[PDB]
Amino acid sequence: LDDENTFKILVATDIHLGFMEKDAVRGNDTFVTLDEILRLAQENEVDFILLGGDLFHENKPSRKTLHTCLELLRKYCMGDRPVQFEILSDQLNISIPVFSIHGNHDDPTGADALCALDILSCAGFVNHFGRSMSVEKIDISPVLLQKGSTKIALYGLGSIPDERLYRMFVNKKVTMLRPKEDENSWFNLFVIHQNRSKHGSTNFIPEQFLDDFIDLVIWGHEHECKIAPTKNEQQLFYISQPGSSVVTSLSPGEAVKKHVGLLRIKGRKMNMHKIPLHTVRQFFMEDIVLANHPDIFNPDNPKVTQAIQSFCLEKIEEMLENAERERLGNSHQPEKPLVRLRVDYSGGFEPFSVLRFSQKFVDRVANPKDIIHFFR
Amino acid sequence: LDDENTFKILVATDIHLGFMEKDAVRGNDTFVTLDEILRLAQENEVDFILLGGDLFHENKPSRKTLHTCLELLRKYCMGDRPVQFEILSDQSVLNISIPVFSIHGNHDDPTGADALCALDILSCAGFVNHFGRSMSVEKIDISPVLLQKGSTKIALYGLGSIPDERLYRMFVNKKVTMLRPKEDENSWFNLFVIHQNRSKHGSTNFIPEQFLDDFIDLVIWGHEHECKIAPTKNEQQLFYISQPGSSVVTSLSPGEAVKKHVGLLRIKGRKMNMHKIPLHTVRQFFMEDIVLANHPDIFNPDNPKVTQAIQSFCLEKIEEMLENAERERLGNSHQPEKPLVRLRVDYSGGFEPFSVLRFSQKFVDRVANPKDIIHFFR
Ligand SMILES: [Mn+2]
Ligand SMILES: [Mn+2]
Ligand SMILES: [Mn+2]
Ligand SMILES: [Mn+2]
């Protein structure tokens, strides 16, 4: 009734299909989480799915990856209900289209310089948009969607090496074409796959660089979940940074609970509900600074390397237990948690072998080898 | 027997599918010639077809173009006989008996939200292997598709069309580099397909044959429309260059008047041979030059009835060209009926043009370019 003027969109990024495909424990992770994401898409009778990059972990997906994926899309993206919106732009029923950009992982490759998405696109399940051609200047054109009276101008930028893109912005070469008919009638949506934090001098892209006419920015390269839209104080658009749906690196950010988004756009206004992903392997992480507690740990003490070591076993022992606790209400979560302990030995301390650790936890952790880390 | 060590390859370029699709007379030209080309491929039981660009006239082919094409490929490229060679490289796309390897030209170039090419659609349907497309911005690294049939091995290198200025710069700056195979560099026949300007246009608006790595054996040069399909040796580099024509005339130029051909290329071990095959379905195109300053006896600079005397000779030249056409079409039942005809008129001295209207009209039904039948210059 009123919903016929509202876009319902499932928003996800960095699904990383096929990540650690061959590993015995973790190898089915991404395929299950993808099942959840598509299932959510279907339950919420979403208008279309919108992905921010890195759908595939490898730019040349294994037959297995690519087939599992197609099977899943076949399962959840087809159905009785007709697509309820239309593309005003150029170029067995499909009921849930998928719009995606390419990341740095699923980037273009091969003799034809295609992308995994392009295979998907070929099968009929995906609309690859956002891929830039030009060398000298980047002109971004919008896919124009329209549902009832409300109109989305969907802008994309498939992953580009940050150094280049920074340079391009600085030299005023990145320009965003606004629609011909009635610039102001459109909700301006922008999906990008780039570095948001600081890495080098130019190894990121400052939020300020993006045209202020943009309404919502889906920022997709960063794996840490920040899916709840937050306003940028200089430009005033919202930035949503959905997580990834797998942990591909044991970092503070990646420990934040993974979510997908349910995004509604009516007229030129939007709202973002977050949905938690239940099938994601848990990842608990804690820091331990030794220099912070002289009472418990003594710098010069030949039995201190043994006293520390004994506390780590306790910290890890409790993390593992808190895990078994949460998994109580969650039957969907895989059984063996990822666990990491970061140890800052600043002062007068020294490392120790992870072997004894690796062994004692072998069957209660999914990363027996990488369970601990040291630094100055 | 011995043929099981020999690649048979049909070679073509600038087919320009859908060119003047809508025109009443010429609109089915390209689709018929494509039919011939594929039919030749099939008769000669070729191993695979190899195209040098501009398969489609438009980078966003009309439904009609794209469907006719797929119908044709479906017809001639499928069959009982299995593919007899294998790809040692990574990826390749009812049996397919004649694969098509192609590069993109400047017409069928990448476009759209996904930055794909018409070939990529074809590739999707299963009929084409798009190769040669470069990605990088700063440097071009060309990698070879590795084919092998029996004992003989082709390292097929491609370069999808690039704007000439950029490519020239790249070559000069030593940024274009061709990766040679890992295993046994010397075991391979080195084949290179490119779609670029060969003649002189600007200072850098072409690519000098010398720029290409001398380790290449045969170069299929595909952007140029003028048929020069018979391989000829380059005196500095020593590779052969074959420049198959286009299979349609898209511009009334001297070059385009040369009789169109496709190639039948054989590679055994590291040696090759190129038979040329003439395309019979191509609309004829006759063209003659007429320099007025060359004949003062027949044409007088100051003479109010000279513009009428010239005009009367043109009608005769054209009248005879048209007749020589009807002559050749005698043995050729496949050739479309209405010839293209052009007369180039150099009025250097003290002459002046005249209206093509009377001409356009008098030939309307005996020529396929009534409007463009004549040209003037200094
Ligand atoms: Mn990622
Ligand atoms: Mn990424
Ligand atoms: Mn051409
Ligand atoms: Mn061309």
Short mmCIF file of C-alpha atoms and ligand atoms in Angstrom, two decimals, chain B residues 14 16 54 105-107 195 223 225, ligand 4:
data_model
loop_
_atom_site.label_atom_id
_atom_site.label_comp_id
_atom_site.label_asym_id
_atom_site.label_seq_id
_atom_site.Cartn_x
_atom_site.Cartn_y
_atom_site.Cartn_z
CA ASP B 14 36.64 -6.51 -38.95
CA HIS B 16 31.56 -5.41 -38.63
CA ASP B 54 35.52 -5.33 -34.72
CA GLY B 105 38.46 -3.73 -31.72
CA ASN B 106 37.75 0.03 -31.26
CA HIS B 107 34.07 -0.65 -32.32
CA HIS B 195 43.99 -4.14 -33.67
CA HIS B 223 42.42 -2.85 -37.45
CA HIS B 225 40.37 -2.70 -43.45
MN MN C 4 38.98 -0.77 -35.94
#
